Short mmCIF file of C-alpha atoms and ligand atoms in Angstrom, two decimals:
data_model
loop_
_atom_site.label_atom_id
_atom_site.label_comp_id
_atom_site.label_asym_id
_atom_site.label_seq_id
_atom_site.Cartn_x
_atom_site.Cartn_y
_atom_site.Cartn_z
CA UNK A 30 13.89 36.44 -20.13
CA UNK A 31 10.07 36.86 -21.72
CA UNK A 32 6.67 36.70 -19.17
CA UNK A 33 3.69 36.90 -20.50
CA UNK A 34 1.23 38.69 -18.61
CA UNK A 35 -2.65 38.25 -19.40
CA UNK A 36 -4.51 40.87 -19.44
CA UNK A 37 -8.33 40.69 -17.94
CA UNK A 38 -10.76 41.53 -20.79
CA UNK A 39 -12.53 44.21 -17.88
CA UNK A 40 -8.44 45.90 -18.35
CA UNK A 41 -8.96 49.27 -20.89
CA UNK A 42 -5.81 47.84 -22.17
CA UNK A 43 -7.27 44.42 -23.65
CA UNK A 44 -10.05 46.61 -24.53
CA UNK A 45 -8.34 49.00 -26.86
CA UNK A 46 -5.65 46.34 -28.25
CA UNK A 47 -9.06 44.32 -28.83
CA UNK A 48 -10.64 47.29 -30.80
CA UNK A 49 -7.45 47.57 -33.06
CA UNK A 50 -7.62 44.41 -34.04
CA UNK A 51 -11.69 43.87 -35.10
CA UNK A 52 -12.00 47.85 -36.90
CA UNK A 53 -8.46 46.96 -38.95
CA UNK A 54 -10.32 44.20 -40.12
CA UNK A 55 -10.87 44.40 -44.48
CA UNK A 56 -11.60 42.23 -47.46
CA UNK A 57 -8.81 40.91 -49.34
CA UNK A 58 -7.84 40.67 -52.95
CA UNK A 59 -7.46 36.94 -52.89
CA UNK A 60 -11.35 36.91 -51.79
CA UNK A 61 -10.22 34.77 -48.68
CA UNK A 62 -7.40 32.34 -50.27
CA UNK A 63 -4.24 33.51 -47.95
CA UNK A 64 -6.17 34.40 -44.70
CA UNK A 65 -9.67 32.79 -44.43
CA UNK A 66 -12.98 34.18 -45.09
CA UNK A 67 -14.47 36.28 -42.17
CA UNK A 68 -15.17 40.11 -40.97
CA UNK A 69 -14.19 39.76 -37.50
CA UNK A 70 -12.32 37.30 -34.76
CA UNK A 71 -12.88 35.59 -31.64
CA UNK A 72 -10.63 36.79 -29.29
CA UNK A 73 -9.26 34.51 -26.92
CA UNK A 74 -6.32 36.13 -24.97
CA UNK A 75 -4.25 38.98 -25.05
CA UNK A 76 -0.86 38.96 -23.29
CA UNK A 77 1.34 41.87 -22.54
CA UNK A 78 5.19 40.48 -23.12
CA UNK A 79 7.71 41.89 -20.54
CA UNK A 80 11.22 40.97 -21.75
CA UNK A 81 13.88 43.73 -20.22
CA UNK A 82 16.76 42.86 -22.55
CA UNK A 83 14.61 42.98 -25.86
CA UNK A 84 12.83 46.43 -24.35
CA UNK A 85 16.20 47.85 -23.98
CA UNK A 86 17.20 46.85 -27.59
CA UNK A 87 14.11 48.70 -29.03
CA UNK A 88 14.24 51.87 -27.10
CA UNK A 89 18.32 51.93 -27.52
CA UNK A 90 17.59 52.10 -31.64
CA UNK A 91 14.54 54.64 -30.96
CA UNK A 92 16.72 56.64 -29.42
CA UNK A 93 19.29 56.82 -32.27
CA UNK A 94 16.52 57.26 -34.94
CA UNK A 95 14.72 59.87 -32.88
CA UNK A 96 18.15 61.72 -32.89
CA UNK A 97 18.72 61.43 -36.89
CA UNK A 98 14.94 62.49 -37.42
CA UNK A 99 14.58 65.82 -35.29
CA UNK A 100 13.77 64.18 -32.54
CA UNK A 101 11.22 61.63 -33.98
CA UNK A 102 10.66 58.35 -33.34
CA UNK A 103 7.67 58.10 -35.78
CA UNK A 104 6.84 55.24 -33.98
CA UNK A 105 3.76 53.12 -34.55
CA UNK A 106 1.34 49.94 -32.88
CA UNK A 107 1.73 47.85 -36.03
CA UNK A 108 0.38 44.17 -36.55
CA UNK A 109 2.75 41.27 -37.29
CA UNK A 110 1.57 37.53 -38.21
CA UNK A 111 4.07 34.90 -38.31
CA UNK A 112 4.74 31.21 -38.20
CA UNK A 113 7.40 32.19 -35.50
CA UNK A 114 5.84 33.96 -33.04
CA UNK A 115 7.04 31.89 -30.10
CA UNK A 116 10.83 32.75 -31.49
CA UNK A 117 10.09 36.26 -31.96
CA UNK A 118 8.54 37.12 -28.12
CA UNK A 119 11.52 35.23 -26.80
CA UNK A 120 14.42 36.30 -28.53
CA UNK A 121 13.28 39.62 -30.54
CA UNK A 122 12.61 39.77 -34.34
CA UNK A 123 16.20 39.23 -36.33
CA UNK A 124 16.93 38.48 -40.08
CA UNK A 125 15.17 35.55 -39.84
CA UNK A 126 12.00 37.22 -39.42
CA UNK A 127 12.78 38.83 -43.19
CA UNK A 128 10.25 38.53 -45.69
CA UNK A 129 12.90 38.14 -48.47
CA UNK A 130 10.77 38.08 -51.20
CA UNK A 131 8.80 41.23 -50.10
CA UNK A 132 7.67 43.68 -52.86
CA UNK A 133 9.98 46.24 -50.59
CA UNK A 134 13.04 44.00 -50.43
CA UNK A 135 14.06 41.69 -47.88
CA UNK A 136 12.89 43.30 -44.35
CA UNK A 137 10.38 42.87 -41.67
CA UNK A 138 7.04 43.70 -42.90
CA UNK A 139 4.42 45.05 -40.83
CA UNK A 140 0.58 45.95 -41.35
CA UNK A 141 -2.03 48.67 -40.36
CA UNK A 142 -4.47 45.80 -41.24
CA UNK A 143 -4.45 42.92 -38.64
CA UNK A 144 -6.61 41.30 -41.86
CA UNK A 145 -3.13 41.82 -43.56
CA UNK A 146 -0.80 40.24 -41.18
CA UNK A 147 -3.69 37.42 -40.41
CA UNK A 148 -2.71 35.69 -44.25
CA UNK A 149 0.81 34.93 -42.81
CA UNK A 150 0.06 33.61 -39.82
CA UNK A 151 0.87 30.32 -41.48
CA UNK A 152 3.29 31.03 -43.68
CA UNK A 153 3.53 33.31 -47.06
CA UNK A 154 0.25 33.02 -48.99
CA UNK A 155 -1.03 31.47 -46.21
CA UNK A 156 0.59 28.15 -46.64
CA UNK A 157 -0.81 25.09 -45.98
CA UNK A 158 -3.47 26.36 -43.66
CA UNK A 159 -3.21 25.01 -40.06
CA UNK A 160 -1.24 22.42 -38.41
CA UNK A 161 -3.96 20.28 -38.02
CA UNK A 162 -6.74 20.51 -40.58
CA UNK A 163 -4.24 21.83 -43.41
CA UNK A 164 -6.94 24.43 -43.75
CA UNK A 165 -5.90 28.06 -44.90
CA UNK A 166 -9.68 29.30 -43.73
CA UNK A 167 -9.79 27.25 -40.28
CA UNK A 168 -12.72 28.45 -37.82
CA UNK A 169 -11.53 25.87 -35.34
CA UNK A 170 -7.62 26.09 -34.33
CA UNK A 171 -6.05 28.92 -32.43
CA UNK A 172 -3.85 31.30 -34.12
CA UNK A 173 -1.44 34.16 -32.60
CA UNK A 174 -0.77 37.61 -34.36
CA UNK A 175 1.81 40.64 -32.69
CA UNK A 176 0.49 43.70 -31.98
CA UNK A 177 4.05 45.43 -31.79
CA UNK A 178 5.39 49.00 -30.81
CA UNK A 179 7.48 49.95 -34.77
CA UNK A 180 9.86 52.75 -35.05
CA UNK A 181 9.82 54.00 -38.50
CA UNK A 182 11.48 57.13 -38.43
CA UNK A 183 12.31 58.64 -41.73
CA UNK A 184 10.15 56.24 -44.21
CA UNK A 185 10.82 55.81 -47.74
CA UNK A 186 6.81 56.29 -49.55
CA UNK A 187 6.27 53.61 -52.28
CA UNK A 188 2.95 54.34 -53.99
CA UNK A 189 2.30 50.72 -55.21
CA UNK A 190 -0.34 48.19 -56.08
CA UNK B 2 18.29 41.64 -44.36
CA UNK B 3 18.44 44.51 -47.02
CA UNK B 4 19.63 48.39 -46.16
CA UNK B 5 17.21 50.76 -45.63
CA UNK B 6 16.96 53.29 -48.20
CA UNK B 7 19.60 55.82 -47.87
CA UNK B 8 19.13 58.76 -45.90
CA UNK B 9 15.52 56.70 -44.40
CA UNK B 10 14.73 54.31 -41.55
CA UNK B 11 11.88 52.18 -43.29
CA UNK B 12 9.90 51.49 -45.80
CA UNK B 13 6.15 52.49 -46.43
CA UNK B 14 3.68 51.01 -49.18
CA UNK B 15 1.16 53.29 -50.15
CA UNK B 16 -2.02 51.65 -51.26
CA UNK B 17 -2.59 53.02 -54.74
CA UNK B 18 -5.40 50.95 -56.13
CA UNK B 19 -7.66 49.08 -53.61
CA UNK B 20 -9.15 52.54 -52.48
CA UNK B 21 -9.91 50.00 -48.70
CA UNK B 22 -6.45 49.14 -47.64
CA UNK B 23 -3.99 50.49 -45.41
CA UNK B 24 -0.63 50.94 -45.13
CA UNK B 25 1.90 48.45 -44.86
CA UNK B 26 5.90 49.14 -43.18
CA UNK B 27 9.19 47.49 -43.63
CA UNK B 28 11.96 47.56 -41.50
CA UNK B 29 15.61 46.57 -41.70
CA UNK B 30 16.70 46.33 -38.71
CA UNK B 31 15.49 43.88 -35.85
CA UNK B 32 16.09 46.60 -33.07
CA UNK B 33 13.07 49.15 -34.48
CA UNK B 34 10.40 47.19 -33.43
CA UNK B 35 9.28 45.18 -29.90
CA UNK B 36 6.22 42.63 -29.65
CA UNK B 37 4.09 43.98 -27.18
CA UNK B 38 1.18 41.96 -27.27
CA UNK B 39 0.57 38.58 -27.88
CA UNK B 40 -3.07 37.62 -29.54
CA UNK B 41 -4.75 34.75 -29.21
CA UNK B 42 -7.73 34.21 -31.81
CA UNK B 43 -9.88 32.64 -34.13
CA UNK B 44 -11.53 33.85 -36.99
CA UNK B 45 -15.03 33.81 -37.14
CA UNK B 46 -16.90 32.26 -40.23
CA UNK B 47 -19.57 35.22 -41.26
CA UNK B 48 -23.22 34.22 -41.18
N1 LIG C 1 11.33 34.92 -46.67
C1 LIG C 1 10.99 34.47 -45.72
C2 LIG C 1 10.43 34.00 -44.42
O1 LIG C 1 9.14 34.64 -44.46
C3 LIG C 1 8.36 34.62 -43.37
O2 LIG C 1 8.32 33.63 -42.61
C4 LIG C 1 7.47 35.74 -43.25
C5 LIG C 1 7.13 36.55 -44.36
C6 LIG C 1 6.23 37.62 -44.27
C7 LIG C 1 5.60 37.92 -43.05
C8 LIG C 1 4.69 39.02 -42.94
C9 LIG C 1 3.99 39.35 -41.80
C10 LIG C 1 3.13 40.44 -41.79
O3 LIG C 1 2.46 40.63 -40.77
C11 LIG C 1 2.98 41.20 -42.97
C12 LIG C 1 2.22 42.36 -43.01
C13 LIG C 1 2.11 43.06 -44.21
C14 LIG C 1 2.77 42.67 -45.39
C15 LIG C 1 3.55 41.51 -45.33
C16 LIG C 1 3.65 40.81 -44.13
O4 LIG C 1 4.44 39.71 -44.08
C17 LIG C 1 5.93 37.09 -41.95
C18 LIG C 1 6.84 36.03 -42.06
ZN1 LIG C 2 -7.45 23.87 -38.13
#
């Protein structure tokens, strides 16, 4: 059911989703360890993905939030890195999507940073780098991050670490 | 997946010591969020 449309960098639309991505940009705590050391990306493409059944899904469960928060969605453009991308723009983020060793408990985590969401591109901590270099810090091979529409509703503040 | 904390939707962490960071969000339920956009990148090494 997913298309992925591409979006011309000329479009306002890559143009803003661009913009999120470089100014969320930050130095981590790991100096570079999970993620890579840079201050900014290359983009190469930016896809809008269409799926009618998964759409439906998400604004079904807005809908019920909005209605047990006063009519508020509290909902949010929120980056998400992930070894399974492909799984998740196909068939919608499930359990298996779960960080279950999260400092917040087994959910689906999501970050204001696009830095943030860059160190699990592949894999917790960054895992062995990429595919083909094994290389946590690769400049050379192509990696994917979700720039994804998150309702929140009522949230639960943890002041942490 | 975990439950939500009763009587709440998600999850936020606060950054409380690295005065630069924003916030993070859990969710517990599949449904609450859609992936919009798909990025295609690279990081660039700094000069
Ligand atoms: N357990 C298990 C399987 O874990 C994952 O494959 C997985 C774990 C965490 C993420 C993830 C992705 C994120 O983008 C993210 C953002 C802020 C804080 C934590 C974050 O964690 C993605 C996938
Ligand atoms: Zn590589």
């Amino acid at each position: 059911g997913t298309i992925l449309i591409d979006l011309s960098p000329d479009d306002k639309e890559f143009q803003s989703v661009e913009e999120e991505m470089q100014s969320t940009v930050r130095e981590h705590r790991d100096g570079g360890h999970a993620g890579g050391i840079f201050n900014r990306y290359n983009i190469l493409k930016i896809q809008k993905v269409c799926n009618k059944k998964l759409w439906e899904r998400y604004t079904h469960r807005r809908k019920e939030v909005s209605e047990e928060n006063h009519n508020h969605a509290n909902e949010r453009m929120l980056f998400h890195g992930s070894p399974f991308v492909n799984a998740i723009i196909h068939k919608g983020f499930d359990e298996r999507h779960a960080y279950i060793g999260g400092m917040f408990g087994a959910g689906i985590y999501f970050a204001e940073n696009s830095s943030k969401s860059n160190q699990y591109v592949y894999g917790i901590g960054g895992g062995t780098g990429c595919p083909v270099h094994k290389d946590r810090s690769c400049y050379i091979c192509h990696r994917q991050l979700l720039f994804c529409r998150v309702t929140l509703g009522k949230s639960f503040l943890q002041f942490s670490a | 997946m975990a439950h939500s904390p009763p009587g709440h939707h998600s999850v936020t962490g606060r950054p409380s010591v690295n005065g630069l960071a924003l916030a993070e969000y859990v969710i517990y339920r599949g449904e609450q969020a859609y992936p919009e956009y798909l990025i295609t990148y690279q990081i660039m090494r700094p000069e």
